[PDB]
Design a protein around this ligand. Structure first.
Ligand SMILES: COC(=O)N1C[C@@H]2C[C@@H]3O[C@]2(Cc2nccnc23)C1
Length: 130
């Protein structure tokens, strides 16, 4: 229905706004573009599904997310990729792990405060009907 297409358009507006607020935070600059395969050629041998905030906006605009749950699976993949690629005790690995955990915690905190639980349930019920 037109009402259901209006529901998904409101979800995309919400997701673009959350993603922009994460992308302008200086702590999260390393997560804003894909890891350069020229400068880090081993990255795509270890990490089987790369993800970054520029790819997330492209996916919102391609209508890939029909729920906030499917958006949060990609925020979780950005964080888990950083923890698995950078697991060592040295300061550069510990700094990127702390920033990855902060990106995840910040996204979940904005959604807990600003997403109505009945708007998410409506998106889940339209998705399940398709
Ligand atoms: C989410 O970003 C990451 O997981 N990484 C790991 C890479 C390794 C290291 O820092 C990255 C980029 C880079 N470029 C040149 C030399 N070394 C590095 C960013």
């Amino acid at each position: 229905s037109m009402q259901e297409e209006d529901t998904f358009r409101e979800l995309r507006i919400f997701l673009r706004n959350v993603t922009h607020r994460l992308a302008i935070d200086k702590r999260f600059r390393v997560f804003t573009k894909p890891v350069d395969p020229d400068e880090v050629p081993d990255y795509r041998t270890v990490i089987k599904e790369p993800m970054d905030l520029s790819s997330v906006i492209s996916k919102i605009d391609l209508h890939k997310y029909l729920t906030v749950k499917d958006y949060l699976r990609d925020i979780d993949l950005i964080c888990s990729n950083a923890l698995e690629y950078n697991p060592d005790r040295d300061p550069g690995d510990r700094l990127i792990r702390h920033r990855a955990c902060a990106l995840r915690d910040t996204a979940y905190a904005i959604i807990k405060e600003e997403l109505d639980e009945d708007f998410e349930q409506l998106c889940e019920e339209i998705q399940e009907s398709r």
